[PDB]
Amino acid sequence: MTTNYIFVTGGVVSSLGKGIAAASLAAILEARGLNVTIMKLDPYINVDPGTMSPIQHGEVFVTEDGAETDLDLGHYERFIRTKMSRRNNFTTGRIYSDVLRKERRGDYLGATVQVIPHITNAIKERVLEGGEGHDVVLVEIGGTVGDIESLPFLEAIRQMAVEIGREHTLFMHLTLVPYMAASGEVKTKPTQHSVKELLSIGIQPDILICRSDRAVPANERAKIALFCNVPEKAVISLKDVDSIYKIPGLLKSQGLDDYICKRFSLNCPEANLSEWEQVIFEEANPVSEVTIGMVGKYIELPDAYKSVIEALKHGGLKNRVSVNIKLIDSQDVETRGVEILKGLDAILVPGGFGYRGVEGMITTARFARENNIPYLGICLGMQVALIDYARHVANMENANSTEFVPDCKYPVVALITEWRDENGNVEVRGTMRLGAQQCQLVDDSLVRQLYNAPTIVERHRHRYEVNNMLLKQIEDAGLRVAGRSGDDQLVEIIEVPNHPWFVACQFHPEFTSTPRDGHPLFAGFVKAASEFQKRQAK
Amino acid sequence: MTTNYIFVTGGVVSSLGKGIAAASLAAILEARGLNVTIMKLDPYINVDPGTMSPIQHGEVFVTEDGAETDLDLGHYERFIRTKMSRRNNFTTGRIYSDVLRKERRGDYLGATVQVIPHITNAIKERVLEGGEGHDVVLVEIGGTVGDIESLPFLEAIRQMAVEIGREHTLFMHLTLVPYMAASGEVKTKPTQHSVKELLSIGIQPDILICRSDRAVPANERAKIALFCNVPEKAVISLKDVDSIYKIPGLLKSQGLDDYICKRFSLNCPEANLSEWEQVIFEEANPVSEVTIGMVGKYIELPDAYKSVIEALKHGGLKNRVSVNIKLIDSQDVETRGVEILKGLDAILVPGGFGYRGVEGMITTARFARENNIPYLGICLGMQVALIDYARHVANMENANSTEFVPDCKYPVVALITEWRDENGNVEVRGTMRLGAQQCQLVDDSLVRQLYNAPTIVERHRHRYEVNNMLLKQIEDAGLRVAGRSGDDQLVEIIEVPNHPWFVACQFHPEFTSTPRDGHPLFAGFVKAASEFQKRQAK
Amino acid sequence: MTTNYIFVTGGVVSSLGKGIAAASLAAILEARGLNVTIMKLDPYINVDPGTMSPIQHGEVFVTEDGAETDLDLGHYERFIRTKMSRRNNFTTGRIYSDVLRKERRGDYLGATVQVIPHITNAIKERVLEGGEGHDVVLVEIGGTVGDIESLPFLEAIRQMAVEIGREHTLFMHLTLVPYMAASGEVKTKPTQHSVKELLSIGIQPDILICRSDRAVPANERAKIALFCNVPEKAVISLKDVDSIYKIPGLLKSQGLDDYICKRFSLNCPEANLSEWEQVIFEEANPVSEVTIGMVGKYIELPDAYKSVIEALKHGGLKNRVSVNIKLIDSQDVETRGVEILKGLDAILVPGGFGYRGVEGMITTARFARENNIPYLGICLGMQVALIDYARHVANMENANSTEFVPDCKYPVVALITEWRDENGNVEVGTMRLGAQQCQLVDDSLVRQLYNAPTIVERHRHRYEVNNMLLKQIEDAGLRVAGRSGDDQLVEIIEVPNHPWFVACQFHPEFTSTPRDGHPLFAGFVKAASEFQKRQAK
Ligand SMILES: Nc1ccn([C@@H]2O[C@H](COP(=O)(O)OP(=O)(O)OP(=O)(O)O)[C@@H](O)[C@H]2O)c(=O)n1
Ligand SMILES: Nc1ccn([C@@H]2O[C@H](COP(=O)(O)OP(=O)(O)OP(=O)(O)O)[C@@H](O)[C@H]2O)c(=O)n1
Ligand SMILES: [Mg+2]
Ligand SMILES: [Mg+2]
Ligand SMILES: [Mg+2]
């Protein structure tokens, strides 16, 4: 009945996969019947990732309650069925912002407000708030042990372990064990030094997860155990794998979940990883192959598109199609033309902001539409598909979004308060749309048969809407509105009927796709890519 | 022409006198003709000390531009003639508060805002802003090297020293060298360990200031030099002294200012410490002695009254009177009566907020008034002297301040917007008063002959004013308004004419008193205490 | 004429190439005309490497004065022309051994002997002994910064820097900058943490050498500079290279030696690396290839044969031949037979002690002799050749070495004090270490290859050719091609009716270098090449 905490930290270097390891561990525990959750503590000073460029730390993930969060919560939702919310991610900026607010308005009664206890107290309160009510709470600490920015998080969790007690708290520490071509050996020295660094902050790790480009052999594991006050059976090897869905099984085969349940006195049955075995099996046994081009403006950091790239792979799983994803710069389409779009079985244009690279995307949507190449557009990818149709079928020259050209004659995409027609008229009488919202699907649409329900729930993160005042003209010219939502009847999904498969939506369906359940939209997309590839195979 | 920086840090323990050592060093440099300033970096999270109880870190010092600052700026103003301002003190809370504000409003252009570089950049900008335009800038880092809360300050100044270069930056590190009765020796081990801690943050100290209850002998100084990469001549002993005015001379006699001017290539003449020698001489040669009772509500931490206690000593200097200051709890006067006020040659009631202990203060002002004991009241000490006169001479029963009893018939002290008379009437048609303000002194008043000018400038920190609507009645009953100010003609100074010396002011004169120039109000107070003591000596 | 010191340390992991990096930097400085030396400080407790197994330490390098030393001194002598000696290498064990001796003697006068100052004073005195009289002294500190075992070394050199002054000392620190496939980036965090560790011991590094499996780009070098109080030009990338002879040029092109000469106020000309450029060219342009089998008992750890394996590559540089070195366990020859020797163009049997695997080496000598396969035997490789010849030509059944079969009838190899004939008659420790002169026999293959009458080579061995049984072995064919000393001990034997069969008692691999080669190995590799061509057609 008492809540147990597993604090997950990293050492030596930052990019160890703390999130994926925590999520995989959570998936084993959940498969033992336990009520598990995960939360992410980010040391940066942004109050939240909303102000962050996608090229900085990757995509902004969006929870169903509308929070903007670190992309690690995407890994969490793809590995366990617990729903993430605002309380599963917070930053240092959020902590200080809250403490400064209490302080300025007098809540501390004339006390000197100090890093210890007031910042650490605020950290602990948020950890308990997101962990409260679960059997096991995995708490992932961003940063690298030994840096300035994570010390308040570390000191806070050190204090929690004392208060709660060691019957209900574990410290799990990841480190890099690098291979040296010199000695042909992996090296445990960095792990030794990192553990001493963690100890000097007051934290004795209980489990060591060793990352390496290969398995960490027994002798190296015993030497780590010897220098780190950790039992050998708690030194766990996590080599680089070709498929993260294998990671639950790798951790289970080394008894990591047994060790945790023993420390926590949890009596639950053996983990049933059948669902992960099934994903691995599907992935290893494709029947067919396709190449899908993803044309966007953030290609330089693929993590800008983490959840979309994963959604495409889940689409392939459901179809036994191996998906080759080709990242293509939308600005290269502007420079070099559609020469670089050839050889694709489908085209996907994902979300984005700013005008840079948008005209390449409009060009791309046009290419896909005129050549009957399956197309999926997401958010900005819908805007450019609407602009394309407006320019090149509805005969609305230079049609555009006010985000890009604020004073075009044909603002087919615009904020609601900006809506106007080609004569400047308006309707009689920032609003970021965030989180889950119901959408009504139109009878006899592609998407109504894919979702096989009259209403769906999907998540938004966008400001600019389809201008209803110019929509009827584009519809007359052949475009189908496939889904709407809200009192204002905002357009959510459009379709191009005279095409094998041409869909674009305003919401981000990639945030609800998982490898175990897939997603009906991406499954249909990849299936259409496969059918195209077989037609052109003649 | 280039600005030089001396970063002052402390190790081993916090209460080393970093402020007094920095101020004394500044006084030597200033006496060599240099344009010097000092600034204080506080690791706590309060945006500024305004919200801090006086019992936490001592008095809230107030600069002439109205800033609320750490009391260390009182030491700075008592040692150098440069004027302190808002830019000579800032906190971690101020740094984060500023960075969060730029971040939320988009000033960082989608970047991840990090401790390094964005917090440290903001620290450096403030250091340059307060140092810009001086020959030498002393930068005092609050906290103890090795704690979490000071690491951003330390990393920031490490980066400054690299950018500016070591021709213009010095690290001066204070440590404790404790005496062990066991070995009859002082111990350098803590200094060794603290320097390694500072080094592990990236900072090689250049000067070591050794605090101890006695001189640190040569052999111990050489051993510190040996383990700390510091030349012997830069290991400076600063024993506990009976008088901080000796500290400039102690530091000069060990060549510390020579060493600094050599590192900085400054060609200035030998320091002329005549003014400090004169203060020391006055202090060592009093003619007479007095006991002054200070009756207030914060007696448990004398630093609640730092600048007042110093002002009394400067008053004694100007008169060659040795002042014995007796801290008396105003709440003991409520419990035990005026039995504890006997044997005093003068009574001073200082500032404060809250009703707790105020009635003891009113009682005290009455005792001093009825027995012709010299009295000085400051801010709250003026309010209680007005209340006393209102109750016991003007026959305004239960007269009080709205701060304490919001609905009394006779609110003789109240916020301007609350002013009303005993019948509830008002005038036809939070405002904290902070900083320097002109005050007009009334002809033929005690204070007009003490200040010997028709207008003065003094500093305020208060909200509650003398109610003008009830003032004329108290004046008719004998009380003299000695000084006023502003358009609203607010009462600044009151006097009781039928008394040897009874003065109370609304502003804080203790913030402009120095040991070299004294202060005309306190000088008169202590002189009146001496005359009383000689009358009662019969 | 003031001696400058460069202290070389390593962080993050041990196997960074400290010795090779120091040796490569010393090569650049030597190519500017500077008088440079290098010395190695090892944290282990062995008084010296003489006791260590080659299977764990690597080979025992032997200097010309006869010290047994770390194999790093082999790299030193292959990069600069200064001769190493006992002064160039010492261990923690040697330091504690010296201090304990004075203490028990009474030299400290009843003081408490302490790590500081007495262990550190002892370390500093040995550094000054090795360094004095040179322009620049590179001082390699073994271990990894942050480990217990090298703290006394680090505290000693911190103190020296203060005493000597920073105008004449530099700290140069290697680190690992690992590449993460996750991010596609190399990572500077371990360098940041290692430098803080070095700072916390009291040492501010001046130069950071960044080891990685690829070049460390400028943004990462700039980030390292920013966090480590090191200027950007003093952050040097040293990627994994396919030939260590490229490393001097790689460091020169990043200005490393310019930086050092400035700090030390040395005005000397530009480094002329043309001899290293020639070595790089030769290695990159082999005209043919050979496979040479190295048949020994320590092949489990290749570094057991570090210098032999280098000498073979030098032999290939001189003949423009790519040498393919096949390590063959001599016990497999005992178990599986001589078929594991087929497809070799030459055969080499290197040094060793103890009997395990020796009968396999004896079988290998016979095979190479009975098949006219080029053979080169070194130390124990000479004994098995002599044994093979005694058994199967001179008809001395079970001929052996007293070291292996102490009471054999024909002890063709034995200690001098053990020499006896096959009837037990006799004539009316002794570890030979270091340089010794040898006299070459006229008309011998080796007199021709060495092209002089006398040579100097280095010994490390106890067991000699038994002169009382040798005249029998000569009459049966075997030619003595070289001899040393008063007792006329056999140094080189030869089988004349063979294309190329030489075995020697000294370790010629210790005097071979990439720039000058070695007459014996150049001839060996040339003979393998000619054999490989006759086999084709
Ligand atoms: N002493 C330091 C230095 C860096 N940081 C923080 O570390 C973060 C950078 O993280 P990371 O990318 O892991 O480190 P890098 O310095 O970029 O190093 P690397 O080359 O290994 O990525 C920044 O947010 C910065 O605030 C810190 O807290 N303490
Ligand atoms: N806290 C420690 C731990 C180990 N050692 C020393 O480190 C040496 C081992 O060096 P190395 O092989 O680099 O360390 P390993 O522990 O084997 O680590 P790795 O896996 O990286 O090889 C030993 O001689 C031992 O004395 C030390 O001095 N201080
Ligand atoms: Mg090892
Ligand atoms: Mg002592
Ligand atoms: Mg990075």
Curated annotation (Swiss-Prot), chains A, B:
A cellular component term, taken from the record's GO annotations: cytosol
Binding residues annotated for UTP, in chain numbering: S14, K187, T188, K189, P190, T191, Q192, K223
PROSITE patterns, per the entry: GATASE_TYPE_1
EC number: 6.3.4.2
UniProt: L-glutamine binding residues: G352, L380, G381, M382, Q383, E403, R463
Binding site for ATP: S15, L16, G17, K18, G19, I20, D72, K239, D240, V241
Domain Glutamine amidotransferase type-1: start-end pairs: 291-535
Activity regulation, short description: Allosterically activated by GTP, when glutamine is the substrate; GTP has no effect on the reaction when ammonia is the substrate. The allosteric effector GTP functions by stabilizing the protein conformation that binds the tetrahedral intermediate(s) formed during glutamine hydrolysis. Inhibited by the product CTP, via allosteric rather than competitive inhibition.
Any one GO molecular function term: identical protein binding
GO biological process: 'de novo' CTP biosynthetic process; pyrimidine nucleobase biosynthetic process
Active site residues according to the UniProt entry: C379 (nucleophile), H508, E510
Subunit structure: Homotetramer.
Membership in a protein family: Belongs to the CTP synthase family.
Further information: CTPSs have evolved a hybrid strategy for distinguishing between UTP and CTP. The overlapping regions of the product feedback inhibitory and substrate sites recognize a common feature in both compounds, the triphosphate moiety. To differentiate isosteric substrate and product pyrimidine rings, an additional pocket far from the expected kinase/ligase catalytic site, specifically recognizes the cytosine and ribose portions of the product inhibitor.
HAMAP family: PyrG
Reported function: Catalyzes the ATP-dependent amination of UTP to CTP with either L-glutamine or ammonia as the source of nitrogen. Regulates intracellular CTP levels through interactions with the four ribonucleotide triphosphates.
Protein name, UniProt field: CTP synthase
Originating organism: Escherichia coli O45:K1 (strain S88 / ExPEC)
Name of the gene this protein is made from: pyrG
